[PDB]
Amino acid sequence: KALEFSKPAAWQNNLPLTPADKVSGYNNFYEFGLDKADPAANAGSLKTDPWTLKISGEVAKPLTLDHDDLTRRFPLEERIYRMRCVEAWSMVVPWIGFPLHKLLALAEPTSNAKYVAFETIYAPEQMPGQQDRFIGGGLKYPYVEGLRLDEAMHPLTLMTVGVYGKALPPQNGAPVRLIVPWKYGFKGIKSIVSIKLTRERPPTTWNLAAPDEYGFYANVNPYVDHPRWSQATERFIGSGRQPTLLFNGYADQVASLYRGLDL
Ligand SMILES: Nc1nc2c(c(=O)[nH]1)N[C@@H]1C(S)=C(S)[C@@H](COP(=O)(O)O)O[C@H]1N2
């Protein structure tokens, strides 16, 4: 479904784009199966409209948004970001959405709020992966993720509601999905149902599944490898190899957040 959005020059560029059919044909969405083609083939069984997105926790004005809100409450913008999955493949995608800080501003987070916890919809009857230990990759469902508050407020982190000029296909995490371009793809949680501001660091699906391989921060870094493969290089998914950049190329926009700190 086509939709209206602006094209801020800050997020417009000359990066060669990943074809739309690959953006929505090569996916990781375990709730619909482990294979890259499983989501495009099975995600159609998920009902994305009506939708309820609930903002709560250490917030002063907890609110809830319906499906129409996702595309009208805030002005939409197209941003051409690179998307680097931890498995060493990457894409350049023209997402569409609104910065997460505009949403958090409405809820007005309290002085105790330190982290943001996200949760994906739970519908075992529409999601085959939520029923088979191997089909769903053995992940503890529903999928959960979190960000430190300053990360969630960064102007780069996007609440994504569409791609390539149109609403998001279900395989891409329709109707609302998270995108943090400087981190590995698993941080970009799909089909969000809940956003909670918390005082402590929330749990993370992949870090719970393998604490030794997937960290909480997961910043794209070519110098720190994955226990089972190097992160120095990556397969660009174009039509039909390149070195991985620090923070996936947004180092000068995000380095500030991590200077002088550990992990
Ligand atoms: N709910 C949910 N969100 C998710 C996943 C998932 O399996 N379930 N996998 C992802 C991982 S590991 C990647 S690399 C990206 C992929 O987004 P895309 O399919 O739209 O490219 O989504 C992340 N978000």
Ligand SMILES: [W+6]
């Ligand atoms: W990934």
